[PDB]
Amino acid sequence: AMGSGMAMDTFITRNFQTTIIQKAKNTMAEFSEDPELQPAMLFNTCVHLEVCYVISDMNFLDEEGKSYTALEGQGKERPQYEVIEGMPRTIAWMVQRSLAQEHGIETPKYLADLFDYKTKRFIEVGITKGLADDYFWKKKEKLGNSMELMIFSYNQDYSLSNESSLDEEGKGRVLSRLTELQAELSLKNLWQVLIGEEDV
Ligand SMILES: [Mn+2]
Ligand SMILES: [Mn+2]
């Protein structure tokens, strides 16, 4: 129980790519948060970042706004999305402001997770231990119509502001990853004590 920090630290190392982990550690230390003392926060950041990459790498985009999968596009001579999560927050805000300026659109008040070059919209991603619909409308309160929302729960429910933002195979990649993580956390008795994103 007091070893829950070390158990979560170890879990993180065994369940995520080194690249994912290093970014999350860096963002916590920007908030002057010790990952060793706030392991729940480190886990949540890792999952969030991994989901954003799972959404962004799924398709690529050409000059005229046509999308391709990685296989379809290879050799033709960018990722459909700019990933704003995963970098220091000062650099993140530079990116969001540049993207808005480049495209002649408003700059959202809050920091986005992704930017979709196809629709020219910012996207917020959320992962909840609770009901996705609840979290969705909680974010809507603050965000309004400034961004699209993609909310996923560990319990396989989800809520999307734009249903065409994910095919059923992309949804299945995200949700299956979350289901697998919850099963493992449950087996380690780490699930009940995890503080989800929706309570931060
Ligand atoms: Mn964010
Ligand atoms: Mn988010």
Residue numbers in the entry: -6 to 70, 74 to 196
Give the exact sentences the study uses for this entry.
The heterotrimeric RNA-dependent RNA polymerase (RdRp) of influenza virus is composed of subunits PA, PB1 and PB2. It is responsible for replication and transcription of the segmented, single-stranded viral RNA genome (vRNA) in the nucleus of infected cells. Transcription of viral mRNAs occurs through a unique “cap-snatching” mechanism. We initially screened metal-chelating compounds by CEN enzymatic assays, followed by a cellular phenotypic screen and then optimized the chemical structure to improve the pharmacokinetics and safety. This culminated in the generation of the compounds BXA and BXM that target the CEN in the PA proteins of influenza A and B viruses.
